[PDB]
Amino acid sequence: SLALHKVIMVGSGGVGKSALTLQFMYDEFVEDYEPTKADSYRKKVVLDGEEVQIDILDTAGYAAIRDNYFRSGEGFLCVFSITEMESFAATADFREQILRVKEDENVPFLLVGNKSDLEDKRQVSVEEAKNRADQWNVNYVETSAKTRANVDKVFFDLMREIRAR
Numbered sequence: 001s002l003a004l005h006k007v008i009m010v011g012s013g014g015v016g017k018s019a020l021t022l023q024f025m026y027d028e029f030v031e032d033y034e035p036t037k038a039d040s041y042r043k044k045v046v047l048d049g050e051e052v053q054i055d056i057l058d059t060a061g062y063a064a065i066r067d068n069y070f071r072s073g074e075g076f077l078c079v080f081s082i083t084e085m086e087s088f089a090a091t092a093d094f095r096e097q098i099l100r101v102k103e104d105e106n107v108p109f110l111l112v113g114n115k116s117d118l119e120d121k122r123q124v125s126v127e128e129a130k131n132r133a134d135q136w137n138v139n140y141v142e143t144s145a146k147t148r149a150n151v152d153k154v155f156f157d158l159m160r161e162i163r164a165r
């Protein structure tokens with residue numbers, strides 16, 4: 001059995017949780033994935049010379065069920081869309097939930113600003129997202145599930161944080 005890294009995708013609706021997951025898993029940009037469907041994925045990848053298994057829980061939004069899922073997670077990709085300010089505002093809600101369940105302010109966590117390809121319709125500045133990440137002591141990365149920009153990066157960077165726990 002190889003090392004297993006459990007990642008959880010969180011964020012408000014339509015930010016790109018599923019598209020990022022499927023782009024990472026199948027190298028395809030899926031634009032119509034059922035908004036209400038939560039699923040898990042698993043695949044073997046090579047992380048810095050070592051073959052490891054990554055498990056990704058793509059959440060879709062009772063309390064006991066959601067808490068158990070967060071407890072099982074080892075790292076979190078907190079996603080928002082750079083084109084929707086409200087989704088950025090919502091990241092504070094997920095941060096609070098994760099800290100409540102994990103009871104660890106150093107839990108592997110990346111703030112992910114998705115849909116970077118839509119610069120034209122950006123509502124969240126790089127400055128404000130970076131500032132929030134700094135205040136939370138986490139790293140910020142902008143991705144595009146459409147062009148694949150930084151998609152592998154966020155998953156691999158998070159795995160390195162899980163490995164370093």
Ligand SMILES: Nc1nc2c(ncn2[C@@H]2O[C@H](COP(=O)(O)OP(=O)(O)O)[C@@H](O)[C@H]2O)c(=O)[nH]1
Nearest residue numbers: 013014015016017018019030031115144145146
């Ligand atoms: N242009 C663009 N559209 C994206 C991107 N990521 C997701 N989308 C679109 O946004 C919609 C919602 O994405 P989805 O991954 O299903 O959101 P979820 O609710 O967070 O799972 C879909 O129509 C996607 O094709 C991205 O990086 N760029």
Ligand SMILES: [Mg+2]
Nearest residue numbers: 017018034035
């Ligand atoms: Mg989804």
